[PDB]
């Protein structure tokens, strides 16, 4: 189903620091509605900058503790049938 692919890099070095996949949401993409991201041309199609206002809305689905003061975050909305 739908998984939030989160990646983050160091603000200064721009070097990769980590990646985490949220749980599978099945066919429930309401998460994108809370972010205000239309489904059209955005599922399996691009990475989005994790703006500040989005952190409180995304942090619930990730074990990593988003730190936008030290890193830059990106999230893509990936969808594959069944578990993966």
């Amino acid at each position: 189903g739908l998984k939030l692919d989160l990646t983050w890099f160091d603000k200064s070095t721009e070097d990769f620091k980590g990646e985490e996949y949220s749980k599978d949401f099945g066919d429930d993409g309401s998460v994108m509605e809370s972010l205000g991201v239309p489904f059209k041309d955005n599922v399996n199609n691009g990475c989005f900058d994790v703006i500040a206002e989005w952190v409180p809305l995304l942090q619930p689905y990730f074990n990593h503790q988003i730190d936008i003061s030290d890193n830059e975050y990106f999230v893509s909305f990936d969808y594959r049938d069944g578990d993966w």
């Binding site: 990769f16 239309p38 059209k40 199609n45 500040a52 969808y79």
Partner: protein, 470 residues
Amino acid sequence: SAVAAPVAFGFPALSTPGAGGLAVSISAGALSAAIADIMAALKGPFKFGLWGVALYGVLPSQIAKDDPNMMSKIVTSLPADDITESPVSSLPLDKATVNVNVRVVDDVKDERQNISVVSGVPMSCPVVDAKPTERPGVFTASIPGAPVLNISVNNSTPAVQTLSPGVTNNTDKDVRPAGFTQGGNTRDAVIRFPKDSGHNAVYVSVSDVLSPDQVKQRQDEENRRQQEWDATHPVEAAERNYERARAELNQANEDVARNQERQAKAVQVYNSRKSELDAANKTLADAIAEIKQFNRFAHDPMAGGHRMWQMAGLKAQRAQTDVNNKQAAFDAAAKEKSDADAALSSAMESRKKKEDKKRSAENNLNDEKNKPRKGFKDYGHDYHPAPKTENIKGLGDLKPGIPKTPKQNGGGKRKRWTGDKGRKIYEWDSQHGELEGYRASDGQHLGSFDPKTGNQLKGPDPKRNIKKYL
């Protein structure tokens, strides 16, 4: 390093931070029924979404600053348990964040920044551990992008009774959808105190007081995001486009009704002023006829009848002067009745125009409501899923890289990887299901590669490059 007047939970403390940071003095006590009730209403089972109620309005221009070139902050505190989905005490001492049912964020609606409470969607807050200070009862807490907090909480102390200039409780208290940029300039957190401190956890939200210019930037952003949403949700768009017509129509009806009142009153005043003029003219006509009746004495200063003639002139002037005042009043009434008649007619017009408008909207709403809509899963098949970093074979060790190349459709940036010691860049082409390689230094295209094997599917295209994005 300062101090502040004790403030109650829910109260929006306004201050201009010093080099020492923000002072936070809380007047402990169950949160006011006013706030608690609003929060209760906000949680009302509404349709899934983030909803909010604006508690306060911020008025930049009214801020009593030391120097206009300052950054004022508004700090609203609430009991942590009133916010967290689960008692803070029942939380591992090693947790950095916690789920919450409500947050206090800054939101921009109609060219104005406000402080609102929002709820309706899963949310998380950072858990900051407060540290001791030499001064007892005084703790320090460091929240992400906010000045250091010098928090202080007292079980029972006075509380500021009035809002500081720059913040008003005069707001639209109706429950509304939180904005796209809600909390864009707010940093909040649940502050938990030292083991044996004795203080319960406290939620704190810090918002920057935006300037007129900054409020505009937010609003324009809200607008752009709303338009992008409307552009991709035909039905939802038609819905609000119709609801908007529903309102404009009603407002046109109250308009005609208001003009019918203006006209009715104008007619009443007209008739009334007309009668007064008509009567005033009678008196004048009789004083003029009276001078005429005694004009035969107009040249005989010696006759007593000359006094009658002279007196008649006096009466006539007094009557003329009154008629003049009456005529002016009546003319004003005549101009009012005329303007009221045109205005009422004009309202009638717009009201009709509004009626047609609502028809085009109520119809379009159904037309777009009768069309076939694709579900989420359909969208999930429009493009090829990207491979997992550790599954890309044949290209050696790959490390993800900051996305930068704009996507053709939608608002994302192509998924980027790094290989060959950071000399080769590989981006995912979700439309064809293959990787595109690029030279790091040049940005020049190297070719198309299969993620499963690493084999080259197509060779280098001189016309392609991403130098513009590194």
